Design a protein around this ligand. Structure first.
Ligand SMILES: Nc1nc2c(ncn2[C@@H]2O[C@H](COP(=O)(O)OP(=O)(O)OP(=O)(O)O)[C@@H](O)[C@H]2O)c(=O)[nH]1
Ligand SMILES: Nc1ncnc2c1ncn2[C@@H]1O[C@H](COP(=O)(O)OP(=O)(O)CP(=O)(O)O)[C@@H](O)[C@H]1O
Ligand SMILES: Nc1nc2c(ncn2[C@@H]2O[C@H](COP(=O)(O)OP(=O)(O)O)[C@@H](O)[C@H]2O)c(=O)[nH]1
Ligand SMILES: COc1ccc2c(c1)CCCN2c1nc(N)nc2ccc(F)cc12
Ligand SMILES: [Ca+2]
Ligand SMILES: [Mg+2]
Ligand SMILES: [Mg+2]
Lengths: 332, 54, 437, 427
């Protein structure tokens, strides 16, 4: 029998992974601060990575990648893309982004370029049109904010003239295989989108929660991949694979292949896996855009069973073996 | 990648290589503390030898 | 020429010292009776091996070493080993009753009874030194003598030699090899009391040395002999500049200058490659780049930790064997790209480099194979504070129940030196984190 | 680092006498005292327990003490009796009559200075005296009452040496008299205060192991003492032979005893063997491990699963893979990490000796400081108050100067000990 502890009680995902683990009759659950675990489903901040991999006779495995915050923190993610050659300022799937602190680095010189063509100058934190309106919002909070080119021409689902984002769940295992969960989710705004009233950020901000209309066209403002592909076929004569999924698989492979030397636990004394949630935005031209990478990501209720079982088979049992796939291996 | 101060000799050589520029208590003070813990020992032993005497 | 006095304390210190001096002798061509054919300067010389040996009218070359152990067992094997004739009896000091794994017993109780005796035998070699540099102090964080008598001796040295340098080779405690359950108490107690007295300390975590011996020497369960012969190799790499003609790290001051910008934070991580088994009959000799790349694989460090997740302040490369500067800068160039090597903004991102052409020396009959070239990287990365976290945590677990506290108090200590030495640590861990984010 | 051995009373001297037989056979010394041995390992540390006599004979550093000449005449008549130094048979004639007050306060007071004189003689001879180990039983009168009295005087004269006992706990399953719970509660009070290490050899456990596990219908003290001399050899091992450890009484206490009163250890032996009959297949290191941790192999009738291990110390004797030991000892902890306290890191330590004991090709001795030993003292405290609440048999004691008050204090100090042992089983 393998042992495991559990240090994030708020984890809807690994809540399941603990539940399923025990139920194999081969996993037992020690107490939070018992060091003699094979597996740490650990906390989100200050996870004690320097304490893992020092238990003689214990193969230790944790469900986070020390370093992954570079890709999962909004200011960090910008910093990562501007300065790694692998991504370059000439990066074609990330919206223009600048880091401004509150007490404009080269943010101002871009906005003025837009005065040169009166081009779209919507941005986000939160959404304004004049720089002053926004800049005074970041010093009003006190922490570091990042501002980005709002996507003024997004793709709208009809019936509804409606906005949405796509969350893919990717699982990186101890070997740095990159597994895309085939089941995706579109988080859709029930509110018809319009570009006059930004401050009415309910048809602009696509967060499932912030949508406190909730349930009109599809249940829970969530359309899955089978419905959306059908709509794409019928409405645009294309498919989800060709028009959108390729690019998503390019971005996921790219972001993760970038930071690999910095987080790979290949020759290390403990080992990491981590589930990520990638959040994309497909514009009117069927171009996929990367918005946020989420390091502690929730699943969609319908899929927890399937995803959390695949976590066990791919990331947990691969290491601790016991007595087709739901994943796309992104090849590198 | 600048190499510098390269000194050679018969046994080997040495050099630096830059890839980028930047951006006590007293003997008596001991004697005290040492001796304070010899006392604390001799007291504790006395409390033992006293209790045994009872 | 300037001399260096080696002080081996406890069992770990004394046995590691044997491993080293034996190695020094092979490297310098001294034989176990202390005769050194190649020395023509008989009965003297301001040669560079004279940093570690003095010469006798009769031409013997005698370690500037002293061995101190609160207990006669270990230094007795020194007194009777192949290198007996090497040392002057006054050099090998022995107690009768050891410090029972007890920092307080070794520092206070038994400590006070021998500190004066040791410091005279130490002053006896200091008085054969035209220009004394400092001390190389070898010990363990875990023995009671190891941890407790070293801090007492360290404090005194800072008094009777305020002008000289003190360097440490400390064994950090690993449960596979460990003799004791209270070793986390002794580690914290001894570091807090010794910190302002050491100028530069190289930590060797027995865990690390042990897995290296298993992975790379195909040794099933390493003995102390396995570990110590490997630890000397690294010690020799680190001390070779003091004993050989060279331009890099020629005095104990240079180690501070080169590796220690801020003074507390004076624990340079050491990585060493290649460790090759003498049992392998066919072996492919590793290149300057293959060995230099191995300095950034954790699996080679004296302390397991992740330098990617930390920042550098300094970095030497100590090569021994067939290396030329050009192959080094090449391997450096390629590696700069592929590795996560982040320096503190206020330090240059450079590598001080030393090459000694004499290839590594292996003990006839040892576990290490001879090799054409080898390197020992010395990098003061903040990622070594991981070791302080680990140790400090164990300390916290036991101390919250005050388990074993009474054995210490009972020797004259005060439950407060416990929280005082641990606050210091809590500082040290904060210092590290400021420098590293 | 000499050890000075003291055996007091019927039980004391009988287990005492087997031990010397058992370890003289290991060190290859015969009843004449002349070494006829194989390895030199057998003489490297022989001085810990034996003084060396002219003519290169070996003389146990043993003081034989009793208030009655009976058992001590036996010990002399017995197989290794002549080995013992005759000046060290210190005895009186009255007897202590299964009475703790006769041994501690009257009959035993007359004789203790003469015992202490034989002690001091042996002590002076010594180079670095480690301390003392005493065999005795807590349920009779001499070794129980005079025993604790001696210990109380040795601590005054040698306040900084180590005090070690092997203390037989009384069991109704194997009892001489109804007052044995009184005697034990008085002694344990003493032991909480004046020993660094005592090994709790429960006669209840020795009986169960002789009855159940070794299928002995009607076990004698000889069958029980066989188990005792097996454990006594085992826990002594890292003191008598050279090794990586180089062990002594003080380090043993430093590492085993987190808090000072909690210094009562559960001994364990594996494989359990019955006298005479040898079985011929050695165990596999996996077997040694799960037996030595098996409560059926515990010599103090407690359930280790009813408590947590504060610290553990195990000793593997024979020729075997230290790799496999390591893997097997690591394997029991990680499987059963619950039953070890989390707040003493790496609290199990293992050691190995090449020489096995007479009759086995491999064996494991186990020294556990479990909080489950309270079960032992709870058992003796109940039996105690069953009688005391009715002041029963108390006259045999008030008759010798003792006072009801003294009984309340002991009962109480012991009930405290149980509380303490229960505090840490929850932390
Ligand atoms: N690498 C290495 N470590 C050792 C050696 N000897 C002991 N150690 C380590 O040192 C720690 C204990 O310190 P010791 O040096 O053995 O104790 P001591 O210095 O003699 O102090 P005492 O308590 O009086 O015995 C243990 O955790 C061992 O792992 C050795 O020869 N080589
Ligand atoms: N450049 C851009 N142009 C247009 N709309 C954008 C945009 N960037 C983000 N959005 C939309 O506005 C929302 C901004 O909020 P944000 O992305 O920070 O929420 P979030 O992604 O942090 C929630 P979670 O962490 O749970 O995924 C995005 O979710 C997306 O719906
Ligand atoms: N295991 C064991 N227990 C014994 C032996 N002899 C006596 N006992 C126990 O010791 C108690 C009697 O104490 P005893 O030593 O005989 O009285 P004393 O001579 O005055 O010390 C009883 O409870 C017995 O169970 C023995 O040889 N082996
Ligand atoms: C809590 O960890 C321990 C427990 C015990 C011991 C130590 C540490 C280190 C020093 C002495 N020591 C031992 N002494 C004696 N006599 N026998 C032993 C048998 C087996 C063993 F593994 C250790 C010992
Ligand atoms: Ca010379
Ligand atoms: Mg020692
Ligand atoms: Mg009797």
């Amino acid at each position: 029998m393998y042992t495991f502890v559990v240090r994030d009680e708020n984890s809807s995902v690994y809540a399941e992974v603990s539940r399923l683990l025990l139920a194999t009759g081969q996993w037992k659950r020690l107490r939070k601060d018992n060091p003699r675990f094979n597996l740490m489903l650990g906390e989100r901040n200050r996870l004690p990575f320097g304490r893992l991999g020092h238990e003689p006779g214990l193969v230790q495995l944790v469900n986070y990648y020390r370093g992954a915050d570079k890709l999962c923190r909004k200011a960090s993610l910008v910093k990562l893309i501007k300065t790694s050659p692998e991504l370059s300022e000439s990066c074609t799937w990330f919206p223009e982004s600048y880091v401004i602190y509150p007490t404009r680095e080269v943010f101002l010189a871009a906005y003025n370029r837009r005065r040169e063509g009166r081009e779209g100058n919507v941005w986000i934190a939160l959404i304004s049109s004049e720089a002053s309106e926004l800049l005074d919002f970041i010093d009003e909070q006190g922490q570091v904010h990042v501002i980005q080119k709002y996507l003024e021409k997004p793709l709208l689902l009809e019936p509804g003239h409606r906005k949405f984002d796509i969350r893919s769940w990717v699982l990186v295992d101890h070997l740095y295989n990159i597994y895309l969960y085939r089941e995706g989710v579109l988080r859709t705004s029930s509110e018809p989108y319009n570009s006059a009233n930004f401050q009415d950020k309910t048809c602009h901000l696509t967060n499932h929660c912030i949508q406190k209309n909730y349930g009109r066209y599809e249940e829970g403002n969530e359309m899955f991949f089978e419905e959306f592909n059908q709509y794409l076929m019928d409405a645009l004569n294309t498919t989800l694979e060709n028009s959108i999924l390729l690019q998503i698989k390019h971005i996921i492979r790219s972001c993760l292949m970038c930071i690999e030397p910095a987080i790979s636990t290949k020759h290390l004394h403990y080992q990491s896996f981590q589930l990520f949630g990638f959040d994309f935005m497909v514009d009117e031209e069927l171009k996929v855009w990367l918005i946020e990478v989420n390091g502690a990501p929730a699943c969609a209720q319908k899929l927890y069973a399937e995803l959390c079982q695949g976590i066990v088979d791919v990331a947990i049992s691969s290491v601790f073996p016991l007595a087709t796939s739901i994943f796309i291996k992104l090849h590198h | 990648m600048e190499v510098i101060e390269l000194n050679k000799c018969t046994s080997g050589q040495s050099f630096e290589v830059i890839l980028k520029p930047p951006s006590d208590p007293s003997l008596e003070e001991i004697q005290k503390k040492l001796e304070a813990a010899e006392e604390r020992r001799k007291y504790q032993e006395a409390e033992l030898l006293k209790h045994l005497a009872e | 020429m300037r001399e260096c006095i080696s002080i081996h304390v406890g069992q770990a210190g004394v046995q590691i010292g044997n491993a080293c001096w034996e190695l020094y002798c092979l490297e310098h061509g001294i034989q176990p009776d202390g005769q050194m054919p190649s020395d023509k300067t008989i009965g003297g010389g301001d040669d560079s091996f004279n940093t570690f040996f003095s010469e006798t009218g009769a031409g013997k070359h005698v370690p500037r070493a002293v061995f101190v152990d609160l207990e006669p067992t270990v230094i007795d094997e020194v007194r009777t080993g192949t290198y007996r004739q090497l040392f002057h009896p006054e050099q090998l000091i022995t107690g009768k009753e050891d410090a029972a794994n007890n920092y307080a017993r070794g520092h206070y109780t038994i400590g006070k009874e021998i500190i004066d005796l040791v410091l005279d035998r130490i002053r006896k070699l200091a008085d054969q030194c035209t220009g004394l540099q400092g001390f190389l102090v070898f010990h363990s964080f875990g023995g009671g003598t190891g941890s407790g008598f070293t801090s007492l001796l360290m404090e005194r040295l800072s008094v009777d030699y305020g002008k000289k340098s003190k360097l440490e080779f400390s064994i950090y405690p690993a449960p596979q090899v460990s003799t004791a359950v209270v070793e986390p108490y002794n580690s914290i107690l001894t570091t807090h009391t010794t910190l302002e007295h050491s100028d530069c300390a190289f930590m060797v975590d027995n865990e690390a040395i042990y897995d290296i011996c298993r992975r790379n020497l195909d040794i099933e369960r390493p003995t102390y002999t396995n570990l110590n012969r490997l630890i000397s190799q690294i010690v020799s790499s680190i001390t070779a500049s003091l004993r050989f003609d060279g331009a890099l790290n020629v005095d104990l001051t240079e180690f501070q200058t080169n590796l220690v910008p801020y003074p507390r934070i004076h624990f340079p991580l050491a990585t060493y490659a290649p460790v090759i088994s003498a049992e392998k009959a066919y072996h492919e000799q590793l290149s300057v780049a293959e060995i230099t790349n191995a300095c950034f694989e954790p699996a080679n460090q004296m302390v397991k930790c992740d330098p990617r997740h930390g920042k550098y302040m300094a970095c030497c490369l100590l090569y021994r064997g067939d290396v030329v500067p050009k192959d080094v800068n090449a391997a450096i160039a390629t590696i700069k790209t592929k590795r996560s090597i982040q320096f503190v903004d206020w330090c240059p991102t450079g590598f001080k480099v030393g090459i000694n052409y004499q290839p590594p020396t292996v003990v006839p009959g040892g576990d290490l194979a001879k090799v054409q070239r080898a390197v020992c990287m010395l990098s003061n990365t903040t990622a070594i504070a991981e070791a302080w976290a680990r140790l400090d945590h164990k300390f916290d677990l036991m101390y919250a129940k005050r388990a074993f506290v009474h054995w210490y108090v009972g020797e004259g200590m005060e439950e407060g030196e416990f929280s005082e030495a641990r606050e210091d640590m809590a500082a040290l861990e904060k210092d590290y984190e400021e420098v590293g984010v | 680092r000499e050890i000075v051995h003291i055996q007091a009373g019927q039980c004391g001297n009988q287990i005492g006498a087997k031990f010397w037989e058992v370890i003289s056979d290991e060190h290859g010394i015969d009843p004449t005292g002349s070494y006829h041995g194989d390895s030199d390992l057998q003489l490297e540390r022989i001085n810990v327990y034996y003084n060396e006599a002219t003519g290169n004979k070996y003389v146990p550093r043993a003081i034989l003490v009793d208030l009655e000449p009976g058992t001590m005449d036996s010990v002399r008549s017995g197989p290794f009796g002549q080995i013992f130094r005759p000046d060290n048979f210190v005895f009186g004639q009255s007897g202590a009559g299964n009475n703790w007050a006769k041994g501690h306060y009257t009959e035993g007071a007359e004789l203790v200075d003469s015992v202490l004189d034989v002690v001091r003689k042996e002590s002076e001879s010594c180079d670095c005296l480690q301390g003392f180990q005493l065999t005795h039983s807590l349920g009779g009168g001499t070794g129980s009452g005079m025993g604790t009295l001696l210990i109380s005087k040795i601590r005054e004269e040698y306040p900084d040496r180590i005090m070690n006992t092997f203390s037989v706990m009384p069991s109704p399953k194997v009892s001489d008299t109804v007052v044995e719970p009184y005697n034990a509660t008085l002694s344990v009070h003493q032991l909480v205060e004046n020993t660094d290490e005592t090994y709790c050899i429960d006669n209840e456990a020795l009986y169960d192991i002789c009855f159940r596990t070794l299928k002995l219908t009607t076990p004698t003290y000889g069958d029980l003492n066989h188990l005792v001399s097996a454990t006594m050899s085992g826990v002594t091992t890292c003191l008598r032979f050279p090794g990586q450890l180089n062990a002594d009484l003080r380090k043993l206490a430093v590492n085993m005893v987190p808090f000072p009163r909690l210094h009562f250890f559960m001994p364990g032996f594996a494989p359990l063997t019955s006298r005479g009959s040898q079985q011929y297949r050695a165990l596999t290191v996996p077997e040694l491990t799960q037996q030595m941790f098996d409560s059926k192999n515990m010599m103090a009738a407690c359930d280790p699963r009813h408590g947590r291990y504060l610290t553990v110390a195990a000793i593997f004797r024979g020729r075997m893979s230290m790799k496999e030991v390591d893997e097997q000892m690591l394997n029991v902890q990680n499987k059963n990490s619950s039953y070890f306290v989390e707040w003493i890191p790496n609290n199990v330590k293992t050691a190995v000796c090449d020489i096995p004991p007479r009759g086995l090709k491999m064996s494991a001795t186990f020294i556990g400081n479990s909080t489950a030993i309270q079960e032992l003292f709870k058992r003796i405290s109940e039996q105690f108050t069953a009688m005391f609440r009715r002041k029963a048999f108390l006259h045999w004691y008030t008759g010798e100067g003792m006072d009801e008050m003294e009984f309340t204090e002991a009962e109480s100090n012991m009930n405290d000990l149980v509380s303490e042992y229960q505090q840490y089983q929850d932390a």
